[PDB]
Amino acid sequence: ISRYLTDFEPIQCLGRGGFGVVFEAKNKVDDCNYAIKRIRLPNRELAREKVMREVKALAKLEHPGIVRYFNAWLEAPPEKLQPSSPKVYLYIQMQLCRKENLKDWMNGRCTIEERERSVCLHIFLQIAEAVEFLHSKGLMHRNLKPSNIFFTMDDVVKVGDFGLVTKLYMSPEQIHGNSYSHKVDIFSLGLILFELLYPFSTQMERVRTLTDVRNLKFPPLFTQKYPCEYVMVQDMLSPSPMERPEAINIIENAVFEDL
């Protein structure tokens, strides 16, 4: 007797993000399509109050870098053997963004003349201003990767799924030594800003050149081409979080004086 099937008309599955299913589905009443994320909560009554704390905090979020929230409800569906094992589902209804994301955008633009310094920065600033907002509400994203950077049907850049918890964008302290600061986010931004400015022909050559930059090894053409941005991306990829800039400081940099 589940609220989803009765009140939403499925369209397609979009992925299984964080081992949780995400559906494009039309609300029968308002006749609008929505991205509907569904996870099973942990069974621990302790580690549920954890997840239920996050959703209450995320529902307060209002910013132009943050995918518009609509609703979040719970469903318990009541043969096999004699393990009952109770399974409660958390549904989160969000604004449906484009099926294609910043990696899709990047994949279809593998030449210098297709990566205008102007446009790349404009995409980065929208990400940074979202990460800043999150940090200011005492949250971190810890999930920044082109794969998970979306566009609204209106081409507003959005930071993708986060909260309710590839590693090429992850920070050293995030992968291992798992008591990290919010500055893990600044590491990810660092690689992303670089990647936007630096088009990649082939996936192997990307993974190589990102792994280089990740260890402060920068293609000599990139440094010469974009000198200010080089300076920034070094700081963002600083091995000590403390020496990495706060999103507010990145945003207020000269580089972003244009419209």
Q: How far is the CB of 19 from ligand Z6P (least distance, A)?
A: 12
Of 61, 22, 56, which is closest to residue 39 (Cα–Cα)? 22
**Interface characters, 188-217, with ligand Z6P (x: CB under 6 A):** ------------------------------
Q: Which of the ranges 65-73, 123-131, 226-234, 250-258 carries the binding residues for ligand Z6P, by CB under 6 A?
A: 65-73
Residue 28: Cβ within 10 Å count: 10
Q: Which is nearer to ligand Z6P, 72 or 255 (CB)?
A: 72
* Of 133, 139, 144, 163, the one binding ligand Z6P by CB under 6 A: 163
Binding flag, residue 39, ligand Z6P (CB under 6 A): no
Q: Which is nearer to ligand Z6P, 27 or 223 (CB)?
A: 27
Burial of 63 (0-12, 13-18, 19+ CB in 10 A): middle
Q: Which is nearer to ligand Z6P, 160 or 190 (CB)?
A: 160
Q: How far is the CB of 92 from ligand Z6P (least distance, A)?
A: 5
Query: SS3 for 4?
Result: helix
Q: How far is the CB of 208 from ligand Z6P (least distance, A)?
A: 26
CA angle 11, 13, 17 (to 5 degrees): 145
Q: Which is nearer to ligand Z6P, 121 or 159 (CB)?
A: 159
Q: Confirm if 213 and 196 have CB atoms less than 8 A apart.
A: no
CA angle 50, 129, 104 (to 5 degrees): 85
Q: Confirm if 90 and 74 have CB atoms less than 8 A apart.
A: yes
Binding flag, residue 37, ligand Z6P (CB under 6 A): yes
Of 72, 33, 36, which is closest to residue 153 (Cα–Cα)? 33
* Interaction site with ligand Z6P (CB under 6 A): 14-15, 17, 22, 35, 37, 55, 58-59, 61, 66-67, 69, 72, 92, 94, 96-97, 99, 150, 160-163
